[PDB]
Design a protein around this ligand. Structure first.
Ligand SMILES: [Zn+2]
Ligand SMILES: [Zn+2]
Length: 65
């Protein structure tokens, strides 16, 4: 709060939106979202981008694409 503070994980928006400062429906479980019925955030579906949580992948470990 006072010492430790950063903005990265609070953003749930998928790869393309978080980059473009866009907040989407894509939760922290967009994968499970697909299972539930979701598939891609309105941004990806609107601009026909690519809904992915690569940002999430390269966090703890620099996961490649
Ligand atoms: Zn998005
Ligand atoms: Zn998306």
């Amino acid at each position: 709060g006072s010492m430790a503070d950063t903005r990265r994980r609070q953003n749930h928006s998928c790869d393309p939106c978080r980059k473009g400062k866009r907040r989407c429906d894509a939760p922290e479980n967009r994968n499970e979202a697909n299972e539930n019925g979701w598939v891609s955030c309105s941004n990806c579906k609107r601009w026909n981008k690519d809904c992915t949580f690569n940002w999430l992948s390269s966090q703890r470990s620099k996961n490649s694409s």
